[PDB]
Amino acid sequence: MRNQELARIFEEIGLMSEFLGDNPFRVRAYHQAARTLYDLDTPIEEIAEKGKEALMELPGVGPDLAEKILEFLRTGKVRKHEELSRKVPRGVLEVMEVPGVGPKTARLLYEGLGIDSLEKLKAALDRGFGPKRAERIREGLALAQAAGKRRPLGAVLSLARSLLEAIRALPGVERAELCGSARRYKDTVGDLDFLVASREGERAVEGFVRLPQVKEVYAKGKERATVFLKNGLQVDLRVVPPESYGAGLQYLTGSKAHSIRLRALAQEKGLKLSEYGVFRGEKRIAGETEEEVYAALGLPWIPPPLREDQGEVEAALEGRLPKLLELPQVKGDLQVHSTYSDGQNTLEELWEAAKTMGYRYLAVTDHSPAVRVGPSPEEALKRVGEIRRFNETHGPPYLLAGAEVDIHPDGTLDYPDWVLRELDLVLVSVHSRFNLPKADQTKRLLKALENPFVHVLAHPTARLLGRRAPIEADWEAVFQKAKEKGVAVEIDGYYDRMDLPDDLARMAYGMGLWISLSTDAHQTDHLRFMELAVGTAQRAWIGPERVLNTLDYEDLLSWLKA
DNA sequence: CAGTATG
DNA sequence: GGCCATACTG
Ligand SMILES: Nc1nc2c(ncn2[C@H]2CC[C@@H](COP(=O)(O)OP(=O)(O)OP(=O)(O)O)O2)c(=O)[nH]1
Ligand SMILES: [Cl-]
Ligand SMILES: [Cl-]
Ligand SMILES: [Cl-]
Ligand SMILES: [Cl-]
Ligand SMILES: [Mg+2]
Ligand SMILES: [Zn+2]
């Protein structure tokens, strides 16, 4: 998947050019070029070899750039990127890539204290600015390393589907699933753990490695193999035989924590659970399929997302396995963005998208101004009017007229009451001073929670993955205040951010609280990231009950007043 | 070969 | 650290 390879090269030029001080319109132009190119689904292979006017249908794309997608896909390299690299060390680049730093600051620092690489930094670090801004940099350095090479799930997912077809449709591959971290729907992944049911695996493994998505081979076999892709990632393979495919799936999905409560049950029940089967003596009492095993250990098939050793095993033993949301059930997205703000879409495009998707509704929750220091209280009203007066010049689904409203530090909101009144949906989510002590930052959220027009609490922790640690608050008390005001909480399925995450999502929902689900979609493709959130719901043990997205337009609306 | 790391 | 099968070091 070399759409990364390109979007990579864009953002690079951006960062150097920005650093060097050239035109800021070209500059953002690249950043946005990469940001769609990274999150496309279909491949550039094609439209590259399909003329240019179809290539510019992609948002952010144009001529000046177009002639670079030439330079690249057509002719290989990128002349400007070279010329920039010539003037700007990779040393220094890694300095911008440091969260907190970034071009300007990076320049500042370089002309300030000749800082030109990471070690250069780390030293200086150990000795305008501010002593927070500086310790903010440290914090970044950390997450940088601390996160380190683990990727977010959706940043690869369609690529792990990409493979699975490829793997299934090899010769000598009867069945095959993606397992491990990805099948468990954990927010972050380290590697793709695959399984393959095969008698003859030395045509499996042998031709596994021979796939066009491989850079380097690291390990071969006849029952297994490791690979390090062109993109960076590691995908393993295991090859249990057909009679065992079920235990195969179990072992290769784990988790370690979960698979250990399991094997223990086999022990204390006179049995032996492996990656091959479950046994009494040499007789395999299960393996053929995965339920057929779980049933063999006296349990009701547990869902990957629950496989953590956090309750699932215990609850299985009473039939008390909870009822979970399913992608089927979701009747709408509850945060997307249009061209009234950072979104890239007209409303038609957004509509048509929700239709094919098969939603009953959709909120077009653009941003209040407390973000790009658009829309104005007035342009808010007009927007609402355009929407409402758009709504009835079209069928269903129904575009709710909504807004992601910033919280002010005091806890006041970023539009006024007077506006809020006219909205269908009211999101609220911080984008500002993320680091105040837990319980003063807790005031803030409660102080936000005081307004009664407030519907959802959007991407609550502000967590940007590998870029910003969650924010710090007494959630205990927050969701408390949100239960007792009829206020919902968001799972934001966008891959780079997943507020609410698994462990907070569970807590809340099982505090009595409702839940909003969304993709924060800024381009049409981003809608796909729904099940990402549903997946993450399921892991927080959540049923369709008390999920605003599982209501129907009307009902929801009804709820929206009460 | 056992002893240890590893998925 | 509670598991059970394997591949690598020695
Ligand atoms: N029985 C047993 N199985 C294990 C052990 N360690 C790992 N496994 C299984 C469970 C998960 C599976 C896949 O390997 P990974 O750890 O790479 O995958 P993951 O656990 O989902 O997370 P990630 O892919 O991000 O690492 O290997 C162990 O000590 N015993
Ligand atoms: Cl985690
Ligand atoms: Cl339904
Ligand atoms: Cl007011
Ligand atoms: Cl009113
Ligand atoms: Mg692994
Ligand atoms: Zn947002």
| Domain chopping of chain A, boundaries | 1-87, 88-149, 150-240, 241-319, 320-562
Fold category of A150-240 in CATH: Beta Polymerase; domain 2 (3.30.460)
- Ligand 1 site residues, Cβ closer than 6 angstroms: A 180-181, 184, 189-191, 193, 251-252, 254-256, 259
Distance A181 CA to ligand 6 centre (A): 8
- CATH superfamily, domain at A88-149: 5' to 3' exonuclease, C-terminal subdomain (1.10.150.20)
Q: Which helix (H) or strand (E) holds A300?
A: none
Q: How far is A420 from A27, CA to CA, in rounded Å? A: 35
Asked, colleague to colleague, whether A1-87 and A88-149 share their fold, the answer is: yes
Which ligand has the nearest atom to the CA of A190?
1
Dihedral sign (CA A372, A373, A375, A380):
positive
Tokens (6 digits) for A196: 């393959």
- What DSSP character marks residue A57? G
Task: Confirm whether any atom of chain B, the nucleic acid strand, is less than 7 Å from CB of A181.
Answer: no
Closest of A57, A538, A556, A495 to residue A303, by C-alpha: A538
| Chain C nucleotides covered by protein, CB below 7 Å | 1-8
Q: How far is the CA of A274 from the C1' of C6 (A)?
A: 13
Dihedral sign (CA A302, A308, A309, A311):
negative
Q: How far is A304 from A302, CA to CA, in rounded Å? A: 7
Distance A220 CA to ligand 1 centre (A): 19
Distance A294 CA to ligand 6 centre (A): 23
Q: How far is A526 from A419, CA to CA, in rounded Å? A: 28
Pairing, β A214-219 against β A188-189 = unpaired
- Closest ligand 1 atom to residue A180 Cα is 21
What are the φ/ψ torsions at residue A192 (nearest 5 degrees)?
A: -95, 115
Distance A462 CA to ligand 7 centre (A): 8
Whether the Cβ atoms of residue A322 and residue A544 lie closer than 8 Å to each other: no
Tokens (6 digits) for A332: 């709408």
Among 1.10.150.110, 3.40.980.10, 3.30.930.10, 3.40.50.2300, what is the CATH number of A1-87?
1.10.150.110
Q: How far is A95 from A482, CA to CA, in rounded Å? A: 41
Q: How far is A548 from A427, CA to CA, in rounded Å? A: 13
- Breaks in chain A (C to N > 2.5 A) come right after 127, 373
CA-to-CA separations, A97 to A243, A451, A509, in angstroms, rounded: 49, 39, 36
Q: Which helix (H) or strand (E) holds A561?
A: helix A553-561
Q: How far is A145 from A384, CA to CA, in rounded Å? A: 44
Q: How far is A140 from A118, CA to CA, in rounded Å? A: 12
Burial of A169 (0-12, 13-18, 19+ CB in 10 A): exposed
Q: How far is A55 from A46, CA to CA, in rounded Å? A: 9
Does domain A241-319 bear CATH number 3.40.50.970?
A: no
Task: Confirm whether any atom of chain B, the nucleic acid strand, is less than 7 Å from CB of A236.
Answer: yes
Dihedral sign (CA A127, A131, A133, A137):
positive
Whether the Cβ atoms of residue A116 and residue A89 lie closer than 8 Å to each other: yes
A277, A312, A315, A499: CA torsion to nearest 10: -160
Residue A70: alpha-carbon gap to chain centroid: 31
What are the φ/ψ torsions at residue A266 (nearest 5 degrees)?
A: -55, -45
| Chain B nucleotides covered by protein, CB below 7 Å | 7
Annotated binding-site residue numbers of A for dGTP: 150, 181, 184, 190
Residue A247: alpha-carbon gap to chain centroid: 29
SS (H, E, C) A60-106: CCCHHHHHHHHHHHHCCCCHHHHHHHHHCCHHHHHHHCCCCCCHHHH
Whether the Cβ atoms of residue A496 and residue A542 lie closer than 8 Å to each other: no
Q: How far is the CA of A171 from the C1' of C7 (A)?
A: 26
Mutate to test the pocket of ligand 1, among A224, A240, A251 (most ligand atoms within 8 A of CB): A251
Annotated binding-site residue numbers of A: 56, 58, 150, 168, 170, 173, 181, 184, 190-191, 193, 236, 335, 337, 342, 367, 404, 431, 459, 520, 522
Q: How far is the CA of A539 from the C1' of C2 (A)?
A: 23
A430, A432, A433, A436: CA torsion to nearest 10: -10
Does domain A320-562 bear CATH number 3.20.20.140?
A: yes
